[PDB]
Amino acid sequence: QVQLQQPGAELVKPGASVKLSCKASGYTFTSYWMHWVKQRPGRGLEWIGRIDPNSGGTAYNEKFKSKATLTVDKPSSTAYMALSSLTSADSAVYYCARYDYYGGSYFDYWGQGTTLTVSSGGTTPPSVYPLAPGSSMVTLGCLVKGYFPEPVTVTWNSGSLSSGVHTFPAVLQSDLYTLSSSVTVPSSPWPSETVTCNVAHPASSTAVDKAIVPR
Amino acid sequence: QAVVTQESALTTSPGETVTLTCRSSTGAVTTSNYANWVQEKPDHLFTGLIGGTNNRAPGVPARFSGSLIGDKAALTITGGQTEDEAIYFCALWYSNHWVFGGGTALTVLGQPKSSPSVTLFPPSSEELETNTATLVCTITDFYPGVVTVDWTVDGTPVTQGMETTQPSKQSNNKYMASSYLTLTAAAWERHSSYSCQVTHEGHTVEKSLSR
């Protein structure tokens, strides 16, 4: 089992640098090349550069020639990419991918990527609202509004709710995040017994419990 | 220097041969473009399948093969499997740098298609006490995984202050998504009708309410 681990998220401020790590394991680190890709939704993927563990010899995509810096550390077996003068245009997901060139030739293994968010925005607690139904299976929700940064955890009835449950990905509205969760339950238990939405937002160290009732 | 372009989305059935292609804009995709194909699955699951136009990555199922169909590179999935339902990227080398395509969302029907379960939630009194109002449209259990959301206020198509989540795959294999209509508390007080329409393959499901 070949693997490449990278941090899932990193919050950094505009005008600073970040050093993204990509730990490799499951093979001989120096026999495969390491490439980095940039992804922003709507923009497909963008090849930044490539490095080889041995020479340290690089090939940079000309558009990232002075923005990125590929580097590696043999003993720890991890590849590094340093982004330098960071701005809002550098917020994206950064992947490392292994490529074999002597016995095959292709991209094979990929890490899960680090979502980089470059902003100065202050922490913002989310404002949680109960979603009560629109009038044999009723849908209830919980609106987690305008928080920053990511990410915020939602559970139902303290974990008592398993299925029917759906926590949607977050969307961006005015430089602040928003998501919500849903829970469909037989119309026998609601309002009858109630459901409790549980939201937590680490950055502002805030948890908000909410029971959905029929107003 | 080269925009690589792939089919938007394709739909096949379990057991069939489906072909994804890849157009290069410099000219005909050749053998020195060393076309690479990459599979993307939920939770950022990126896997390499074919490299150098027709070289299958070690371990890749045999039903996957890369080739050249005319002046393009192509990926052929023979006897498409339910697990091949993923997004496939193209990668072309151009003398010192790769350029990627947009990616093709592939659907191998793994189960019967279902229309979405739509539910629209009026803003909560709680929210309106902050001078703003949000309408929430939860969209669940639709397959294949692509839908379009259309909002309206008083029968008119609205515009602006709207956000829709990209589809997200559930545990039963269908997809979910939610969309939002943000209003000023007064704007929600000016208007009377509100409806969330969700199109899923020429078929529309709507949920309307009234303040």
Binding site: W33, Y102, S105 | Y34, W93, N96
Partner: peptide, 6 residues
């Protein structure tokens, strides 16, 4: 089409 020592 290439660039180094691979």
């Amino acid at each position: 089409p290439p660039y180094p020592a691979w």
